[PDB]
């Protein structure tokens, strides 16, 4: 035989091991419209109807946003928009209420509840009205038969909706 000595400089005592990491995908939609009827005298919503252009999704990542439009997600070609239609507002107090509405994702419709939190009601600079409110709730992918090919292991069955709205009076 013959005896050798490592050359520490071009030697690597290496290892690889696979692990999982949980992370939140956050995301909004750049393009959407809404009709908002609100009575500041009673802090009740009267009508809230939203249409969102699936195309305008943004999860800060171009290759994912494109993939969201495909058959195994939104199917934007066939179902270009998602809609929410308020059916009922149940006041808790002036800061808080339970909103019940019909959500439609890719042609499937289910009634959801959002927690309305009125974060501020004002008269503006110009003496015309404003409001700032939030709508929060959790919806289940499974309830909408949405992305059914993707396992609830890889991607959570729960989506957390956070609608943050500032809004001004009309005409």
CATH number attached to the domain at 22-171: 2.40.128.110
What own/partner pairs with CB < 8 Å and gap ≥ 24 does 106-110 have?
A: 106/74, 106/75, 106/78, 106/79, 106/82, 106/144, 106/146, 107/78, 107/79, 108/144, 108/145, 108/146, 110/139, 110/143, 110/144
What span, in angstroms and rounded, lies between the C-alpha atoms of 34 and 50?
4
Cβ atoms of 60 and 24 within 8 Å: the answer is no
Q: Resolution in angstroms, to 1 decimal, for this deposition?
A: 2.5
Experimental method: X-ray
Domain edges within the chain: 22-171
157: which residues sit within 8 A by CB, 6+ positions away?
Answer: 140, 141, 142
Can you tell me which residue has the tokens 């069955």? 157
Name residue 91's beta-bridge partners.
97
Token couple for 161: 């909706």
Can you tell me which residue has the tokens 């059916």? 87
Distances (CA, A) of 8 to 1, 53, 159: 22, 58, 50
Neighbouring CB atoms inside 10 A of 18's CB total 4
What span, in angstroms and rounded, lies between the C-alpha atoms of 38 and 50?
14
- Give a three-class secondary structure readout of the chain: CCCCCCCHHHCCCCCCCCCCCCCCCCCEECCEEEEEEEECCCCEEEEEEEEEEHHHEECCCHHHHHHHHCCCCCCCCCCCEEEEEEEEEEECCCCEEEEEEEEEECCEEEEEEEEEEEEEEEECCCCCEEEEEEEEEEEEHHHHCCCCCCCCCCCCCEEEEEEEEEEECCC
Name residue 105's beta-bridge partners.
108
What span, in angstroms and rounded, lies between the C-alpha atoms of 74 and 57?
10
What span, in angstroms and rounded, lies between the C-alpha atoms of 50 and 127?
27
What span, in angstroms and rounded, lies between the C-alpha atoms of 167 and 154?
37
């Amino acid at each position: 035989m013959k005896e050798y000595t490592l050359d520490k400089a071009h030697t690597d005592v290496g290892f690889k091991i696979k692990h999982l990491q949980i992370s939140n995908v956050k995301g909004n939609f750049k393009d959407y419209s809404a009709v908002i009827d609100f009575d500041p005298a009673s802090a009740e919503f009267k009508k809230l109807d939203v249409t969102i252009k699936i195309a305008s999704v943004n999860t800060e990542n171009q290759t994912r946003d494109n993939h969201l439009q495909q058959d195994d997600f939104f199917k934007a070609k066939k179902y270009p928009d998602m809609t929410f239609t308020m059916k009922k507002y149940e006041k808790i107090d002036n800061e808080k209420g339970k909103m019940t509405g019909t959500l439609t994702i890719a042609g499937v419709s289910k009634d959801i509840v959002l927690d309305a939190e009125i974060g501020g009601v004002a008269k503006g600079k110009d003496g015309k009205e404003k409001i700032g409110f939030s709508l929060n709730g959790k919806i289940k992918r499974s309830d909408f038969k949405f992305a059914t090919s993707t396992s609830t292991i890889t991607l959570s069955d729960d989506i957390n909706l956070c609608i943050e709205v500032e809004a001004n009076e009309k005409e």
